[PDB]
Every structure is written in structure tokens, then in C-alpha cells.
Enzyme design. Structure first.
Site, PDB file in Angstrom:
ATOM      1  N   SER A  44       0.770  -1.241   0.000  1.00  0.00           N
ATOM      2  CA  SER A  44       0.000   0.000   0.000  1.00  0.00           C
ATOM      3  C   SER A  44       0.796   1.283   0.000  1.00  0.00           C
ATOM      4  O   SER A  44       0.182   2.311  -0.208  1.00  0.00           O
ATOM      5  CB  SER A  44      -1.020   0.040   1.138  1.00  0.00           C
ATOM      6  N   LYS A  47       0.499   3.753  -2.985  1.00  0.00           N
ATOM      7  CA  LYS A  47      -0.656   4.643  -3.082  1.00  0.00           C
ATOM      8  C   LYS A  47      -0.254   6.110  -3.187  1.00  0.00           C
ATOM      9  O   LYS A  47      -0.967   6.907  -3.829  1.00  0.00           O
ATOM     10  CB  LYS A  47      -1.641   4.391  -1.941  1.00  0.00           C
ATOM     11  N   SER A 104      -6.074   3.832   3.602  1.00  0.00           N
ATOM     12  CA  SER A 104      -5.565   2.715   2.817  1.00  0.00           C
ATOM     13  C   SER A 104      -6.705   1.888   2.204  1.00  0.00           C
ATOM     14  O   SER A 104      -6.677   0.664   2.181  1.00  0.00           O
ATOM     15  CB  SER A 104      -4.565   1.874   3.588  1.00  0.00           C
ATOM     16  N   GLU A 140      -4.832  -3.492  -6.689  1.00  0.00           N
ATOM     17  CA  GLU A 140      -5.046  -4.000  -5.339  1.00  0.00           C
ATOM     18  C   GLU A 140      -6.034  -5.147  -5.353  1.00  0.00           C
ATOM     19  O   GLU A 140      -7.025  -5.065  -6.086  1.00  0.00           O
ATOM     20  CB  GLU A 140      -5.640  -2.919  -4.418  1.00  0.00           C
ATOM     21  N   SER A 211       1.311  -3.298   3.951  1.00  0.00           N
ATOM     22  CA  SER A 211       1.604  -4.644   4.418  1.00  0.00           C
ATOM     23  C   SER A 211       1.226  -5.630   3.344  1.00  0.00           C
ATOM     24  O   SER A 211       0.415  -5.324   2.479  1.00  0.00           O
ATOM     25  CB  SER A 211       0.887  -4.931   5.730  1.00  0.00           C
TER      26      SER A 211
HETATM   27  C1  LIG Z   1      -1.742  -2.126   1.557  1.00  0.00           C
HETATM   28  O1  LIG Z   1      -0.718  -2.560   1.930  1.00  0.00           O
HETATM   29  N1  LIG Z   1      -2.916  -2.896   1.985  1.00  0.00           N
HETATM   30  C2  LIG Z   1      -4.245  -2.332   2.147  1.00  0.00           C
HETATM   31  C3  LIG Z   1      -4.393  -2.092   3.637  1.00  0.00           C
HETATM   32  N2  LIG Z   1      -3.371  -1.204   4.130  1.00  0.00           N
HETATM   33  O2  LIG Z   1      -3.390  -0.883   5.291  1.00  0.00           O
HETATM   34  S1  LIG Z   1      -1.916  -0.485   6.104  1.00  0.00           S
HETATM   35  O3  LIG Z   1      -1.417   0.525   5.273  1.00  0.00           O
HETATM   36  O4  LIG Z   1      -2.307  -0.069   7.361  1.00  0.00           O
HETATM   37  O5  LIG Z   1      -1.186  -1.561   6.127  1.00  0.00           O
HETATM   38  C4  LIG Z   1      -4.303  -3.458   4.280  1.00  0.00           C
HETATM   39  C5  LIG Z   1      -2.975  -4.116   4.006  1.00  0.00           C
HETATM   40  C6  LIG Z   1      -2.736  -4.217   2.566  1.00  0.00           C
HETATM   41  C7  LIG Z   1      -3.609  -5.332   1.997  1.00  0.00           C
HETATM   42  O6  LIG Z   1      -4.468  -5.147   1.179  1.00  0.00           O
HETATM   43  N3  LIG Z   1      -3.309  -6.524   2.497  1.00  0.00           N
HETATM   44  N4  LIG Z   1      -3.989  -7.686   2.185  1.00  0.00           N
HETATM   45  C8  LIG Z   1      -3.815  -8.329   1.035  1.00  0.00           C
HETATM   46  C9  LIG Z   1      -4.636  -9.574   0.860  1.00  0.00           C
HETATM   47  O7  LIG Z   1      -3.072  -7.942   0.190  1.00  0.00           O
END
Ligand SMILES: *C(=O)N1C[C@H](NOS(=O)(=O)O)CC[C@H]1C(=O)NNC(C)=O
Length: 260
Positions: A44, A47, A104, A140, A211
Site C-alpha cells: 500500500s 498509493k 488505505s 489491489e 503490508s
Molecule cells: C496495503 O498494503 N494494503 C491495504 C491495507 N493497508 O493498510 S496499512 O497501510 O495499514 O497496512 C491493508 C494491508 C494491505 C492489503 O491489502 N493486504 N492484504 C492483502 C490480501 O493484500
């Protein structure tokens, strides 16, 4: 400076993972680098580049940020805290940028990628800023797989720190757009346990976390201590086990080591 390097190497050894750090201190232009030229999956943290691409587009298209985008139930993916509240409604590009950066929201990121023409278009914007390392390949959430040795959706800490400096402090964006990106990152709600947890509480911070698979735990930040010159900090971390749990504490520890 031999002590800070030893501290980062020991933090990496105790963690069992692979740590990437790039600190740019604008006070003297000094840098602290640890695996800063190795690739890591952005997850993420990518972004920031997608929101910035839309900001760049808005410089030649007045009122672009006010353009409306429909959110459908079929657009929903694995994590959509804002978009899920607007199903069968619309969100402006400004609202999607804020949702992507501050919460996010993955649907918001996918709308941004789509708006500019897809992942290769986000990469092209990075190249236009002089970033030859960044690459966006997927949308994503598949862009977060973070498979060891896979170069898709990666960058290096050095590259991302330089770009973040160009975006937030430099002239990569028009003045209004730069201020807007800074405002959005300062309003982030997801970073309290990552870089911010390693810094004095009163410091103004704009960051973007991420993450993914292999316990990938990342954060990129612009740090503005009161009455000081800003710092740019990228902390990327990944682990050997596919289902490893996140390590936001490693990012906090690295931020403390490089700022003390
Ligand atoms: C980005 O890394 N994402 C979306 C979201 N981000 O939140 S964080 O920035 O607090 O980490 C959650 C983690 C990640 C995401 O989508 N993870 N899950 C998968 C299945 O990829």
C-alpha cells in the site's frame, strides 16, 4: 555513523527478516542507508505515487479532483473501509485520494490506477519524476503478494525516499498539488504503530503504511520536527515465511535508531 549501522544490522538479525532503510536529513543532506538499493514490495505504500499521478494530471485539467467516480458493489475487494460506505454512490477523485492515503482503501487506489490508464501509467509518472526504479504492475490487492525474488510492484528505499522528497518538498508537483499531498499524508490514520511510534510524539508526520505477504510491513514518511529541517524516511521490511505476521515494531525501532 558506524554505531547507527551496527544498530540497524542488529535490529535486522533479531527480527529474522530483511530490512530496507533510507533516511534523508535535509538539515545537512546526509543519508542513512541500509539495503537502500535492494528491491522490496511496496504494498500500500505505492498509493502515494498513484495519488501523486492524479495530482500531476490535475495541473493541466482544472477541476479534475472534483470529477465523480461511481462505486459499485462489484468493485469491492479485501479492504474498503470508505468505499463500502458509498456503494451505488459516487466519490470525487479528491475523496478517493484521501481514502487511499488516509485509510488505505484498496477500491480508492484501484480507481486512481484506473483513472490514469492503469499500472504502467503510474510507472510512467514515476519515470517523469526521474524515478527509474519504481514499478507498478498490478492493482489491489494482488500488488501486495510480495513473493521473494519477484520484481513486480517493487522499488528501493533510496528511490522512494528521493521521490517522496521531490513530491512533498521539491518541485515534482505544482505548489497547490504539493501542499494537497502533504495535507493528505499528514491526515493519515493508519501510522501510529509504525514510523511514528519511534519518534517524539510532538513531531508533525505525514506517512503511508503498507503490508503484504511474507509478513511485508512498510512505511514511508516525511517528518517535520518543530523548528528543524524535515527528514524523509522509508522503512521496508519482509520476512522468509509466507504467512508471517506483521512487524510494525521493527519500523518503529528503525525510525528511533536513525533519528536519535
Ligand atoms: C496495503 O498494503 N494494503 C491495504 C491495507 N493497508 O493498510 S496499512 O497501510 O495499514 O497496512 C491493508 C494491508 C494491505 C492489503 O491489502 N493486504 N492484504 C492483502 C490480501 O493484500
Amino acid at each position: 555513523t558506524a554505531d547507527v549501522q551496527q544498530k540497524l544490522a542488529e535490529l535486522e538479525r533479531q527480527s529474522g527478516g530483511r530490512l530496507g532503510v533510507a533516511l534523508i536529513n535535509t538539515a545537512d543532506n546526509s543519508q542513512i542507508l541500509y539495503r537502500a538499493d535492494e528491491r522490496f514490495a511496496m504494498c500500500s505504500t505505492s498509493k502515494v505515487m498513484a495519488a501523486a499521478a492524479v495530482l500531476k494530471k490535475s495541473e493541466s485539467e482544472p477541476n479534475l479532483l472534483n470529477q465523480r467516480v461511481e462505486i459499485k458493489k462489484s468493485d469491492l475487494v479485501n479492504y474498503n473501509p470508505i468505499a463500502e460506505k458509498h456503494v451505488n454512490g459516487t466519490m470525487s477523485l479528491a475523496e478517493l485520494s484521501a481514502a487511499a492515503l488516509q485509510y488505505s482503501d484498496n477500491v480508492a487506489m484501484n480507481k486512481l490506477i484506473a483513472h490514469v490508464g492503469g499500472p504502467a501509467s503510474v510507472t510512467a509518472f514515476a519515470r517523469q519524476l526521474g524515478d527509474e526504479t519504481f514499478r507498478l504492475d498490478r492493482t489491489e490487492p494482488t500488488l501486495n503478494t510480495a513473493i521473494p525474488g519477484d520484481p513486480r510492484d517493487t522499488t528501493s528505499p533510496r528511490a522512494m525516499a528521493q521521490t517522496l522528497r521531490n513530491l512533498t518538498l521539491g518541485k515534482a508537483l505544482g505548489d497547490s498539488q504539493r501542499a494537497q499531498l502533504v495535507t493528505w499524508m499528514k491526515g493519515n490514520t493508519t501510522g501510529a504503530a509504525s514510523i511514528q511510534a519511534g519518534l517524539p510524539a510532538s513531531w508533525v508526520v505525514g506517512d503511508k503504511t503498507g503490508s503484504g505477504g511474507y509478513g511485508t510491513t512498510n512505511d514511508i514518511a516525511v517528518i517535520w520536527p518543530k523548528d528543524r529541517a524535515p527528514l524523509i524516511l522509508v522503512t521496508y521490511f519482509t520476512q522468509p515465511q509466507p504467512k508471517a505476521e506483521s512487524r510494525r515494531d521493527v519500523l518503529a525501532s528503525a525510525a528511533k535508531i536513525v533519528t536519535d
